[PDB]
Design an enzyme around this catalytic site. Sequence first.
Site, PDB file in Angstrom:
ATOM      1  N   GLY A  15       0.815  -1.226   0.000  1.00 25.45           N
ATOM      2  CA  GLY A  15       0.000   0.000   0.000  1.00 25.45           C
ATOM      3  C   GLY A  15       0.828   1.246   0.000  1.00 25.45           C
ATOM      4  CE  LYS A  16      -0.203   6.502  -3.466  1.00 24.53           C
ATOM      5  NZ  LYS A  16      -0.887   7.361  -4.460  1.00 24.53           N
ATOM      6  N   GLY A  17       2.154   4.755   1.549  1.00 25.16           N
ATOM      7  CA  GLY A  17       2.384   5.569   2.746  1.00 25.16           C
ATOM      8  C   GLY A  17       2.350   7.049   2.428  1.00 25.16           C
ATOM      9  NE  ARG A  18       5.996  10.094   6.211  1.00 26.40           N
ATOM     10  CZ  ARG A  18       6.997  10.535   5.460  1.00 26.40           C
ATOM     11  NH1 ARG A  18       6.888  11.603   4.685  1.00 26.40           N
ATOM     12  NH2 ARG A  18       8.120   9.842   5.399  1.00 26.40           N
ATOM     13  CG  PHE A  19       5.982  11.423  -0.134  1.00 23.98           C
ATOM     14  CD1 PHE A  19       5.401  12.225  -1.098  1.00 23.98           C
ATOM     15  CD2 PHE A  19       6.243  11.939   1.122  1.00 23.98           C
ATOM     16  CE1 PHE A  19       5.106  13.549  -0.808  1.00 23.98           C
ATOM     17  CE2 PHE A  19       5.936  13.256   1.417  1.00 23.98           C
ATOM     18  CZ  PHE A  19       5.408  14.064   0.439  1.00 23.98           C
ATOM     19  CG  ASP A 136       3.833  10.351  11.110  1.00 21.60           C
ATOM     20  OD1 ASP A 136       2.885  10.419  11.880  1.00 21.60           O
ATOM     21  OD2 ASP A 136       3.707  10.312   9.858  1.00 21.60           O
TER      22      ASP A 136
HETATM   23  C1  LIG Z   1      12.606   1.677   4.528  1.00 26.49           C
HETATM   24  C2  LIG Z   1      11.414   0.851   4.134  1.00 26.49           C
HETATM   25  C3  LIG Z   1      11.503  -0.138   3.157  1.00 26.49           C
HETATM   26  C4  LIG Z   1      10.377  -0.896   2.877  1.00 26.49           C
HETATM   27  C5  LIG Z   1       9.216  -0.691   3.583  1.00 26.49           C
HETATM   28  C6  LIG Z   1       9.208   0.250   4.610  1.00 26.49           C
HETATM   29  C7  LIG Z   1       7.996   0.548   5.381  1.00 26.49           C
HETATM   30  N1  LIG Z   1       7.515   1.808   5.659  1.00 26.49           N
HETATM   31  C8  LIG Z   1       6.385   1.676   6.371  1.00 26.49           C
HETATM   32  C9  LIG Z   1       5.590   2.833   6.894  1.00 26.49           C
HETATM   33  N2  LIG Z   1       4.167   2.579   6.976  1.00 26.49           N
HETATM   34  C10 LIG Z   1       3.388   2.378   5.898  1.00 26.49           C
HETATM   35  C11 LIG Z   1       3.903   2.344   4.595  1.00 26.49           C
HETATM   36  C12 LIG Z   1       3.067   2.093   3.522  1.00 26.49           C
HETATM   37  C13 LIG Z   1       1.721   1.927   3.720  1.00 26.49           C
HETATM   38  C14 LIG Z   1       1.176   2.014   4.987  1.00 26.49           C
HETATM   39  C15 LIG Z   1       2.010   2.229   6.052  1.00 26.49           C
HETATM   40  F1  LIG Z   1       1.521   2.290   7.318  1.00 26.49           F
HETATM   41  N3  LIG Z   1       6.082   0.395   6.540  1.00 26.49           N
HETATM   42  C16 LIG Z   1       7.074  -0.330   5.901  1.00 26.49           C
HETATM   43  C17 LIG Z   1       7.054  -1.800   5.976  1.00 26.49           C
HETATM   44  C18 LIG Z   1       8.232  -2.523   6.147  1.00 26.49           C
HETATM   45  C19 LIG Z   1       8.237  -3.878   6.285  1.00 26.49           C
HETATM   46  C20 LIG Z   1       7.035  -4.562   6.187  1.00 26.49           C
HETATM   47  N4  LIG Z   1       6.765  -5.858   6.270  1.00 26.49           N
HETATM   48  C21 LIG Z   1       5.438  -5.904   6.065  1.00 26.49           C
HETATM   49  N5  LIG Z   1       4.850  -4.742   5.925  1.00 26.49           N
HETATM   50  N6  LIG Z   1       5.894  -3.863   5.993  1.00 26.49           N
HETATM   51  C22 LIG Z   1       5.861  -2.507   5.860  1.00 26.49           C
HETATM   52  N7  LIG Z   1      10.289   1.017   4.867  1.00 26.49           N
END
Ligand SMILES: Cc1cccc(-c2[nH]c(CNc3ccccc3F)nc2-c2ccc3ncnn3c2)n1
Length: 304
Positions: A15-19, A136
């Site tokens: 899914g999409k996070g902040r960017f 955050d």
């Molecule tokens: C530096 C980096 C590399 C890859 C993923 C993330 C990351 N950044 C966030 C921030 N949150 C976030 C983001 C998108 C959509 C929605 C959200 F809340 N999560 C993850 C993450 C990492 C590992 C993992 N394993 C299973 N899921 N997952 C998620 N960071």
Amino acid sequence: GGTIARTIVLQESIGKGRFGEVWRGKWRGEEVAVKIFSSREERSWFREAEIYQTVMLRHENILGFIAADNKDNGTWTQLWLVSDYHEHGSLFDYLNRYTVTVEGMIKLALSTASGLAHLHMEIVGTQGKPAIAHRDLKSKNILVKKNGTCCIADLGLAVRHDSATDTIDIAPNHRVGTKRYMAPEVLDDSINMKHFESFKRADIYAMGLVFWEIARRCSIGGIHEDYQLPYYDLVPSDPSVEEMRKVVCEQKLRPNIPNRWQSCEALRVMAKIMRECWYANGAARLTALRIKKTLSQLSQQEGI
Ligand SMILES: Cc1cccc(-c2[nH]c(CNc3ccccc3F)nc2-c2ccc3ncnn3c2)n1
């Protein structure tokens, strides 16, 4: 060619996070998480890569960073971050899907506090680590590992301290972060963003809210609360700064502590930590290190 993005195959959109967008991929047969940004999101990608490459950052309760890389598909360039993959996903997802034991609650809360204390702590030395504030912290930005402990992610809005000067490595904007979790002094814009300690204190308020989300799901004799976000009872979904500020700053409300949490030493200690994270005055809040010590003593007594 390169050894990272070249060799990774994306499998599933997360899914999409902040960017950018997160994916599950495969690297040398292993699951990894991949965050992909476009060319016009280079500042966001670079800054998160920069934070994760900080000297001595790695810790069991910080998401394990593998690499930053580029991938040119023949039409456009993608900017990649690659990390460890955690099948449970976020604490938010985990707490929606499951209830936890007293043991489960303490593991989640202690591991989060340990990761935040590590971020916040300056390590002296030639290979020294600057103090870092998150800006955050929330249950969507914490991952649950197979072993039932947490690690902190989305370090892209973090700020790093130069202790010698009490200066910060960027020029912070006001009210970055998730409005629901913003500290009172962020919501009313009274925070002194020239004082690094202010950002640590704002993180502690948010961690208190996350502890409340965990403790709701701590099932004792089959009794627990349903999953909710903090302030679910007081503000709309996707609240504005003004909606939050009226509740947190003017009416001076916090998430309700159920009578049930007095019945049990573990829930009593958790509720007391929450109250001591939720003071309007940041300077009165607990430190992450103090919370870690208190939950470590509780972990020992309950034999986790
Ligand atoms: C530096 C980096 C590399 C890859 C993923 C993330 C990351 N950044 C966030 C921030 N949150 C976030 C983001 C998108 C959509 C929605 C959200 F809340 N999560 C993850 C993450 C990492 C590992 C993992 N394993 C299973 N899921 N997952 C998620 N960071």
